[PDB]
Design an enzyme around this catalytic site. Structure first.
Site, mmCIF file in Angstrom:
data_model
loop_
_atom_site.group_PDB
_atom_site.id
_atom_site.type_symbol
_atom_site.label_atom_id
_atom_site.label_comp_id
_atom_site.label_asym_id
_atom_site.label_seq_id
_atom_site.Cartn_x
_atom_site.Cartn_y
_atom_site.Cartn_z
ATOM 1 N N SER A 1 21.888 24.132 28.752
ATOM 2 C CA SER A 1 20.564 24.578 28.348
ATOM 3 C C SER A 1 20.658 25.513 27.147
ATOM 4 C CB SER A 1 19.859 25.273 29.515
ATOM 5 O OG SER A 1 18.515 25.564 29.187
ATOM 6 N N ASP B 1 16.981 14.443 26.455
ATOM 7 C CA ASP B 1 17.602 15.177 27.563
ATOM 8 C C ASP B 1 18.361 14.360 28.613
ATOM 9 O OD1 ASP B 1 17.830 17.927 28.848
ATOM 10 O OD2 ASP B 1 16.780 16.876 30.462
ATOM 11 N N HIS C 1 23.557 14.144 30.663
ATOM 12 C CA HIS C 1 22.713 15.244 30.197
ATOM 13 C C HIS C 1 22.910 15.369 28.688
ATOM 14 C CE1 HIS C 1 21.416 19.738 30.477
ATOM 15 N NE2 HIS C 1 20.363 18.952 30.337
ATOM 16 N N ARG D 1 8.178 26.914 27.120
ATOM 17 C CA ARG D 1 8.420 25.487 26.977
ATOM 18 C C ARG D 1 7.128 24.784 26.606
ATOM 19 N NH1 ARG D 1 13.862 22.939 27.875
ATOM 20 N NH2 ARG D 1 15.039 24.732 28.670
ATOM 21 N N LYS E 1 14.131 17.462 36.755
ATOM 22 C CA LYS E 1 15.561 17.526 37.025
ATOM 23 C C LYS E 1 15.896 17.022 38.421
ATOM 24 C CE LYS E 1 17.059 19.460 33.150
ATOM 25 N NZ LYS E 1 18.017 18.764 32.256
ATOM 26 N N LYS F 1 20.265 20.344 22.191
ATOM 27 C CA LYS F 1 20.063 18.905 22.359
ATOM 28 C C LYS F 1 18.708 18.471 21.813
ATOM 29 C CE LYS F 1 20.663 18.862 26.795
ATOM 30 N NZ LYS F 1 20.854 20.337 26.898
ATOM 31 N N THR F 2 17.643 19.156 22.222
ATOM 32 C CA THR F 2 16.308 18.777 21.770
ATOM 33 C C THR F 2 16.103 19.141 20.305
ATOM 34 O OG1 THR F 2 15.390 18.957 23.999
ATOM 35 C CG2 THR F 2 13.847 19.152 22.158
ATOM 36 N N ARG G 1 14.119 26.812 36.753
ATOM 37 C CA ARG G 1 14.545 26.217 38.008
ATOM 38 C C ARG G 1 15.124 27.274 38.940
ATOM 39 N NH1 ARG G 1 18.633 24.036 37.128
ATOM 40 N NH2 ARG G 1 18.686 24.246 34.847
HETATM 41 N N1 LIG Z 1 22.027 26.459 14.993
HETATM 42 C C1 LIG Z 1 21.193 26.108 16.004
HETATM 43 N N2 LIG Z 1 21.213 24.870 16.549
HETATM 44 C C2 LIG Z 1 20.385 24.528 17.556
HETATM 45 N N3 LIG Z 1 19.479 25.362 18.097
HETATM 46 C C3 LIG Z 1 19.353 26.633 17.640
HETATM 47 C C4 LIG Z 1 20.225 27.083 16.546
HETATM 48 N N4 LIG Z 1 19.902 28.362 16.284
HETATM 49 C C5 LIG Z 1 18.917 28.715 17.137
HETATM 50 N N5 LIG Z 1 18.584 27.684 17.934
HETATM 51 C C6 LIG Z 1 17.559 27.750 18.989
HETATM 52 O O1 LIG Z 1 18.249 27.442 20.200
HETATM 53 C C7 LIG Z 1 17.389 26.692 21.055
HETATM 54 C C8 LIG Z 1 17.972 25.316 21.332
HETATM 55 O O2 LIG Z 1 17.182 24.827 22.404
HETATM 56 P P1 LIG Z 1 17.094 23.289 22.833
HETATM 57 O O3 LIG Z 1 15.706 23.104 23.409
HETATM 58 O O4 LIG Z 1 17.584 22.395 21.718
HETATM 59 O O5 LIG Z 1 18.161 23.273 24.038
HETATM 60 P P2 LIG Z 1 18.499 21.994 24.953
HETATM 61 O O6 LIG Z 1 19.967 21.741 24.717
HETATM 62 O O7 LIG Z 1 17.523 20.885 24.676
HETATM 63 O O8 LIG Z 1 18.328 22.643 26.424
HETATM 64 P P3 LIG Z 1 17.631 22.006 27.738
HETATM 65 O O9 LIG Z 1 18.624 21.020 28.313
HETATM 66 O O10 LIG Z 1 17.424 23.227 28.596
HETATM 67 O O11 LIG Z 1 16.347 21.362 27.246
HETATM 68 C C9 LIG Z 1 16.065 26.569 20.332
HETATM 69 O O12 LIG Z 1 15.273 27.693 20.718
HETATM 70 C C10 LIG Z 1 16.454 26.719 18.878
HETATM 71 O O13 LIG Z 1 15.359 27.198 18.089
HETATM 72 MG MG LIG Z 2 16.020 20.082 25.755
HETATM 73 MN MN LIG Z 3 18.233 19.731 30.124
#
Ligand SMILES: Nc1ncnc2c1ncn2[C@@H]1O[C@H](COP(=O)(O)OP(=O)(O)OP(=O)(O)O)[C@@H](O)[C@H]1O
Ligand SMILES: [Mg+2]
Ligand SMILES: [Mn+2]
Length: 529
Positions: A241, A260, A223, A324, A204, A245-246, A58
């Site tokens: 980010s 999300d 979020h 992504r 978003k 979460k995912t 973004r």
């Molecule tokens: N202990 C951990 N817990 C969660 N994620 C981890 C950990 N260690 C490494 N990672 C990595 O961190 C990243 C977490 O990304 P994730 O997509 O879950 O973020 P998000 O909170 O969904 O962000 P967004 O809101 O941007 O989608 C992934 O690349 C995952 O492989």
């Molecule tokens: Mg996510």
């Molecule tokens: Mn997000």
């Protein structure tokens, strides 16, 4: 009809592709005569991969909201705490609208009708217009795909016009940040995009609009990811980010609600979206099997490295670390269906990736600590380390349209009515300079969700005053205390004082009310240096 499109200001459209099917998007993306960033390539997993262009994330510095009599007194304006809601004149908006509508005139256009919000009573009916097939694919994946019956009587609440291929030659005269723009107008109920092709500006963008409309009628807009266990117990996972979460909500032991964007009304927690938008950097099939197996036909990969033989180098961040993949949510095997919603959340988890290596892997929060850390919205990032803090209110200030306290107020109300318990989880770093493993983090989540921790014995981390369980099944007890991963507690203490000061300075802006002043007591305590 072309006459309908003319009402939006788009003229002379020769070909209209309404509600493109997944099959048609596939062949559009792989058209061997396409050149430039429209072109997709077929990977050995069956999914198409595309390059999103110069923008691989973004562009918050290019985000503008029209300031008129609808938004003047209700929006959280950037010029009136730090956010990206920069004011735009109606006059400049009209020039921007001219740029986009002229760009889309005389083109073959994709028109995607979809919903934002799983519930009819609060959802937006959004109409997306683009000349790039993979942009239409993105919104088909990420928004809620209507039924044939719903399409028959579809009445747009909001219009998103993606003019990524145009730019604004007047930006200097108009006082804008660049030749690109991501602009919103709540009077015309429209989003305009210019210059950046990045699809998630639309995702978003509509999230930001839900974040405006829902809390103003008492509905939390969050979020967070969300899932539900067999016993009907719902959990939400907030975080910025990259905090997990995912990754962590996509759990085969639980039914995914969404990854999300969620609301929380009188009936419970509901997804805004129809798909998931996973990070693929260093993706491991063994660590994240559900996400990996969702990468197949109809998923849309972004900015990954594809070798000559069609295989994907998921480890290559040369183009961007923000690689992504979007997919419709039914690419995950264990999801809530037919409607992505469930009851009231009783576990609220704040995810943070603490590059300072200070915060414990899991803490159980007091009610006041919950509000303090929700408003703080902390995460941090890393041949040097240089932990760089981010304080983003509500774990998503980039998408907030109202003041942070308005989101906090409604969240607390929903949590109190449900008897929810809150936890803080550091998915980032400790004294080892490595991130806690996904295996350990998943075990921590398991212990939160099964009640293991709600009455477990705890010890208190100094300065932040966080209650840490003394033990937790499946995790090495040593790492529960972040001080144990340094040569001595003194190394931790020095970094903790730095972080505490950062929190304290950041929280000051919230102390102009009595309620906010009172919350200082729940934050980190530092009275020297
Ligand atoms: N202990 C951990 N817990 C969660 N994620 C981890 C950990 N260690 C490494 N990672 C990595 O961190 C990243 C977490 O990304 P994730 O997509 O879950 O973020 P998000 O909170 O969904 O962000 P967004 O809101 O941007 O989608 C992934 O690349 C995952 O492989
Ligand atoms: Mg996510
Ligand atoms: Mn997000």
């Amino acid at each position: 009809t072309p006459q309908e499109l003319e009402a939006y200001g788009i003229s002379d459209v020769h070909d209209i592709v309404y509600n493109p099917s997944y099959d048609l998007l596939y062949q559009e993306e792989l058209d061997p005569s396409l050149t430039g960033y429209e072109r997709g390539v077929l990977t050995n997993l069956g999914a198409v991969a595309v390059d999103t262009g110069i923008f691989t994330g973004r562009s918050p510095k290019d985000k503008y909201i029209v300031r008129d009599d609808t938004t003047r007194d209700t929006f959280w304006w950037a010029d009136k705490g730090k956010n990206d809601n920069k004011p735009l004149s109606p006059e400049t908006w009209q020039h921007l609208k001219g740029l986009v509508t002229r760009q889309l005139s005389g083109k073959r256009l994709f028109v995607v009708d979809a919903f934002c919000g799983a519930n009819p009573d609060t959802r937006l009916s959004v109409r997306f217009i683009t000349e790039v097939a993979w942009q239409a694919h993105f919104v088909k994946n990420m928004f809620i795909r209507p039924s044939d019956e719903e399409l028959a009587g579809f009445k747009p609440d909001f219009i998103v016009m993606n003019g990524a291929k145009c730019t604004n030659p007047q930006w200097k005269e108009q006082g804008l940040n660049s030749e690109n723009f991501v602009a919103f107008n709540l009077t015309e109920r429209m989003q305009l995009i210019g210059g950046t092709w990045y699809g998630s500006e639309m995702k978003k963008g509509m999230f930001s609009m839900m974040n405006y409309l829902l809390p103003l009628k008492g509905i939390a807009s969050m979020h967070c990811s969300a899932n539900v266990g067999e016993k009907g117990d719902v959990a939400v996972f907030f975080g910025l980010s990259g905090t997990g979460k995912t990754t962590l909500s996509t759990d085969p032991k639980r039914r995914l609600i969404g990854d999300d964007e969620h609301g929380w009304d009188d009936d419970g927690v509901f997804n805004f979206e129809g798909g998931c938008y996973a990070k693929t950097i260093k993706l491991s099939k063994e660590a994240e099997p559900e996400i990996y197996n969702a990468i197949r036909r109809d998923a849309l990969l972004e900015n990954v490295t594809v070798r000559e033989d069609g295989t994907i180098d998921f480890d290559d961040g040369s183009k961007t670390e923000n690689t992504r993949v979007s997919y419709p949510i039914y690419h995950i095997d264990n999801i809530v269906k037919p409607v992505s919603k469930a009851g009231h959340a009783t576990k609220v988890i704040f995810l943070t990736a603490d590059a300072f290596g200070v915060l414990p892997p899991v803490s159980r929060l007091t009610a006041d600590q919950t509000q303090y850390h929700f408003l703080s919205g902390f995460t941090a990032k890393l041949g040097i380390t240089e932990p760089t803090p981010t304080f983003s209110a509500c774990f998503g200030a980039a998408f907030l349209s109202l003041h942070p306290t308005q989101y906090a107020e409604v969240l607390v109300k929903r949590m109190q009515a449900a008897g929810a318990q809150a936890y803080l989880v550091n998915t980032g770093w400790n004294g080892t300079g490595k991130r806690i493993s996904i295996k350990d983090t998943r075990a921590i989540i398991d212990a939160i969700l099964n009640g293991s921790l709600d009455n477990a014995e705890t010890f208190t981390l100094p300065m932040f005053n966080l209650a840490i369980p003394t033990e937790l099944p499946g995790v090495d007890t040593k790492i529960l205390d972040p001080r144990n991963t340094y040569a001595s507690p003194e190394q931790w203490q020095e970094k903790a004082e730095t972080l505490a000061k950062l929190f304290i300075d950041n929280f000051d802006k919230y102390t102009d009310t009595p309620a906010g002043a009172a919350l200082v007591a729940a934050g980190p305590k530092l009275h020297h240096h």
